[PDB]
Amino acid sequence: NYTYIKPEELVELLDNPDSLVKAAVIDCRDSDRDCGFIVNSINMPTISCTEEMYEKLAKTLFEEKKELAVFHCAQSLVRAPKGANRFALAQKKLGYVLPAVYVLRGGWEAFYHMYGDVRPDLMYVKLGPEQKLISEEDLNSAVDH
Amino acid sequence: NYTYIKPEELVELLDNPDSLVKAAVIDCRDSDRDCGFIVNSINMPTISCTEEMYEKLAKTLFEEKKELAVFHCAQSLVRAPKGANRFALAQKKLGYVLPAVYVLRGGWEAFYHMYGDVRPDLMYVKLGPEQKLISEEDLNSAVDH
Amino acid sequence: NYTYIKPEELVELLDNPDSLVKAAVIDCRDSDRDCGFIVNSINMPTISCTEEMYEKLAKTLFEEKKELAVFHCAQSLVRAPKGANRFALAQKKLGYVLPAVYVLRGGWEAFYHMYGDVRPDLMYVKLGPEQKLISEEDLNSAVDH
Amino acid sequence: NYTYIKPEELVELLDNPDSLVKAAVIDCRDSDRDCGFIVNSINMPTISCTEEMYEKLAKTLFEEKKELAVFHCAQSLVRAPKGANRFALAQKKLGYVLPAVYVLRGGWEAFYHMYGDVRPDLMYVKLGPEQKLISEEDLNSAVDH
Amino acid sequence: NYTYIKPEELVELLDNPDSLVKAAVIDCRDSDRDCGFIVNSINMPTISCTEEMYEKLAKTLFEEKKELAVFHCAQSLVRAPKGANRFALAQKKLGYVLPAVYVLRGGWEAFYHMYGDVRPDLMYVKLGPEQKLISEEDLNSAVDH
Amino acid sequence: NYTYIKPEELVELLDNPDSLVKAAVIDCRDSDRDCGFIVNSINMPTISCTEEMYEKLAKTLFEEKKELAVFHCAQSLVRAPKGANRFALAQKKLGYVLPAVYVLRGGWEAFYHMYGDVRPDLMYVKLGPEQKLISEEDLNSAVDH
Known part of the structure; x- marks a missing residue:
């Protein structure tokens, strides 16, 4: 059971000081996670997570x-x-x-389509040798000479 | 018909100017295309391309x-x-x-899995409020500087 | 495994109230489910149902x-x-x-094609600001009145 | 070549008498067409339309x-x-x-998801033994009674 | 423009011998035509028929x-x-x-499904050397012997 | 992954009674399966098979x-x-x-295009009220007197 939340409502949670400590973003993608992700998102690849991994997360998110x-x-x-x-x-x-x-309606593709050019602080990638995290905002700052 | 080409074989093709003017890369992805891609790839999204489109491509690339x-x-x-x-x-x-x-064996997933950190000069993304092309190599350079 | 049932045969089950308590209609559609449905069909969208959901259905319908x-x-x-x-x-x-x-041969489209204009009591839609359930029979009556 | 239009953007066109007479809605559905439609949409089912049919539509719309x-x-x-x-x-x-x-981003499902419950005047179905056209707005009215 | 004819309606035509001379059956299959076919149907494969070929058949069936x-x-x-x-x-x-x-609803596959066991006089195959036309009724006979 | 087997190579496996028991033929067709088929091919219709089905198949063939x-x-x-x-x-x-x-190159069409007359003993159909398995060789023979 789940209901759908839109990209704008998700941005609203992520922008709220309290709400954000009350939210978890569960990224279910597998090899396509590295297209870009929300920071703090937890990776649970649907193609490989087992029953006990979901149980463990249920208890951890409850706690x-x-x-x-x-x-x-x-x-x-x-x-x-x-x-x-x-x-x-x-x-x-x-x-x-x-x-x-909740299920994010339209997923990362819709989320990035709507906010990628306007809210680069929300979008992360792994960059380089050591696969270090960085926002597209900071990446943009770094490119701008 | 087609046959398969490996990622190593396609980097040999891309690293050579003579081979490279003789070669086209046709990217067949749709909404997952911007995950990352080969510079100057041609997008023919298999989900929505129609017969005359492949005919015009065939004519263009012969020519x-x-x-x-x-x-x-x-x-x-x-x-x-x-x-x-x-x-x-x-x-x-x-x-x-x-x-x-040719079909690139294992597709973009395998190409990037094999070469994403040894050959970041080959890997492009779009960035910014205007989403311009940039290689991951230059991205690493801007972050290092 | 399963074998096929025709729309004529399904209508015969639904019309016989003994048959009817013994029948369950499983609607396996997803984003196209609200085009029209059988009242009391149970939705188990194929694209997203998981093993345990089928196991729970199997025990419920058995009980x-x-x-x-x-x-x-x-x-x-x-x-x-x-x-x-x-x-x-x-x-x-x-x-x-x-x-x-069983699988309903031809699906909702063959079923509605065959029976939509002679058995509107079988065909439900959702309508209105609250998207409420209502049979096409009821709608026809309302339009007449 | 087409570009995308969003459902909100299509409603703006439909709602303005002038934009409306300059706009045509090409519904490319086939056996799922009667899920619901925009009134005076032109049906050109992609699955079975042939080249001359698109030529005659181009001249008709131009004229x-x-x-x-x-x-x-x-x-x-x-x-x-x-x-x-x-x-x-x-x-x-x-x-x-x-x-x-233009292509209406998300198609009929995203349009009706966004508007079905608040702009029923835009949504048509076919109803009755004659399968006659009626808007959901009119259906809502008849149901009141 | 065409409308649909069901399999039951086509057998009705093919059984009335005055109907039958006012009727042509156009088989648009390509390599799958040999699955089985209606006697004296005319093969116009959609995959390779040219505009001149449809024009010629229009004049011939008219005449x-x-x-x-x-x-x-x-x-x-x-x-x-x-x-x-x-x-x-x-x-x-x-x-x-x-x-x-007219288009035969459900095509050869529905037609054979419905009539292949009860009306084998209506089904033909090509059997053997360079390949002789034989009904399945005659084949069923020849086999029985 | 898989590699291609030409029909000639297939008929070589097939003619061996030794390499017949080392071999399985998987027919992945659906409503077009009965056009003609290899005897004791297993039907795994790609359009409706689920993950578990291929698992059980893999286990079975291993056994x-x-x-x-x-x-x-x-x-x-x-x-x-x-x-x-x-x-x-x-x-x-x-x-x-x-x-x-392996995938048979060119599928059933190629195989039958190449062997349908030289090799009628490899070519099964279903026939008459009980739609009973029978080789075309046999049919040809039964058609002799």
Whole structure:
């Protein structure tokens, strides 16, 4: 079980001081994660996560007092909704209902289409030899001579 | 028909100016295309290209003297093979025999997995409020400086 | 495994109230589900349902004493037979053989084509600011009045 | 060549009497067309339309003074962009550059998802033994009664 | 322009021997035509028929005073309605409106599904050397012996 | 992954009774499967098969000691390569290397184009009210007196 949250509502959570400590962004992508991601997102590849990994995350997000868990993948058509069903079912087996579970409508592709050119502080990539994290804002600053 | 080319083989092609003016890279991805790509790739998104489009390509690349046409998508399992099949068929209809048709084995996923940190000069992304082309090599350079 | 049921046969199950308590209609569509549906169909979108969801369905319909589970999507060529396959394999894993598993030949489109204009009591839509359920029979009456 | 238009942008055109007589809506759906549609959309099912059909549409729209042709299907991922590609290739063959060519981003599903519950005056269905056209607005009115 | 004819309606035509001389059956399949076919159907493969070929058939069926031309392919989704569009367009260009144009709903596959066991007089194959025309009724006989 | 087997090479495996029990033939067609087929090919219709199905198939063929799994569809351009890809993927997950995986070049059309008359004994159809398996050799013979 999950319901959908739009890219703008997700930006609103991420921009709120309190809300953000109450949110987890669960990235369900696999080799396509390195296209770009939200910072702080947790990678749960739908193609490889096992039952016990979802259980462990349910308990960890419960203990961190998360109230929303926002699943996305590339299009949020197949991988994110499947990871959101497994996660909800893990929660129900363990007896939790928080965090509540959402699927980011249209996934990273829609999110990046809408905000990539206007909110580069939200978008991260791994750059270089050591695969170091950096925002597209800081990458943009660094390119601008 | 087509045959397969490996990532090593395509970097040999791209590292040589003579080979390189004889070669076209046809990127068959759709909404996942901007994950990263080969500079001067031609986008023929297999999901929405139609017969005359592959016919015009076939004419253009004959005329431009290309001898190799390398089709790839993300994994080169569904979209690039369909793209090369349709391009082969267009060739057969228009009576051309050149460029000869290749699919990049393992597609962009494998190319980047193999060469993403040894050859960042080959890897392009789009960045900024205007999303301009830039190599990952130059990105590493701006961040180092 | 599954075998096919025609629209004529399904209408015969729905019309017979004994048959009807013994039948479940599994709608396997996703973003195209609200074009029209069978009242009380259970949605199990093929594109995003996971193993445990089929296992839970298999136990529920077994406990409800269902004898037939009729899977359909839009055309019944891809998503309904994939669903019926996942369901038959969930049932087998759990050791159930009832309900027996069918695919509605031709899907909602053949069903509505055949019966939309003579049996509007069978055809439901959602309508209005709250997108409420209502049969096409009820809509026709309202339009007359 | 086409570019994308968003559903909000299409509603602006539809809502303005002047933009409306300069705009045409090309619905590229086939057996899923009757899910719901825009009134006076032109049906050109991508699956079965042939080259002369797009030529005759190009001349008709040109002669009707249309300035925009907005192609959609269900998701606008396969059928609408293919129709828009065929259409733009037929306009070029015949020597026309008006109307300009657009694809409604997200197709009928994203349009009706955004507007179905608040602009029912834009949404048509077919209803009854005659399968007669009616807007959801009128359907809402009749239901009141 | 065409409308649809069901398999039951086509057998009705093929059984009335006065119907039958006013009727042509146009098979638009290519290499799959040999799956089985209707006797004296005319093969117009959609994949290779040219405009001049549809024009010539329009004049010939007109001059034979055909009143119905029923197009089919394997599923009647792509190749038959394309053939029927091309034919109707040839007829309109040449100034004919007879024969009227129909597509066999569900194509050879639905037709054989429904009638292959009960009306084997209507099904033909080509069997053997360079290949003799034989009904399956005659084949069923020859086998029984 | 998989490699291609030419029809000549297939008929070589087939004629061996030794290498017949080392070989499995996977027919990946769907509603076009009954056009004609190899006897005891296994039907894995690419359009409706699910992950588990290829797993069970992989296990089964391993049990049964097979050394070559030959996938084919009508043309072996879309459905069989996908059959083989999903199959190889299942083998890799379950840690099998045998059977090795092949796609028949040109699929059923090529095979029958090349052997339908020289080799009528390899060519099965289903026939008459019980649609019973029978080789074309046999049919040809039964047609002799």
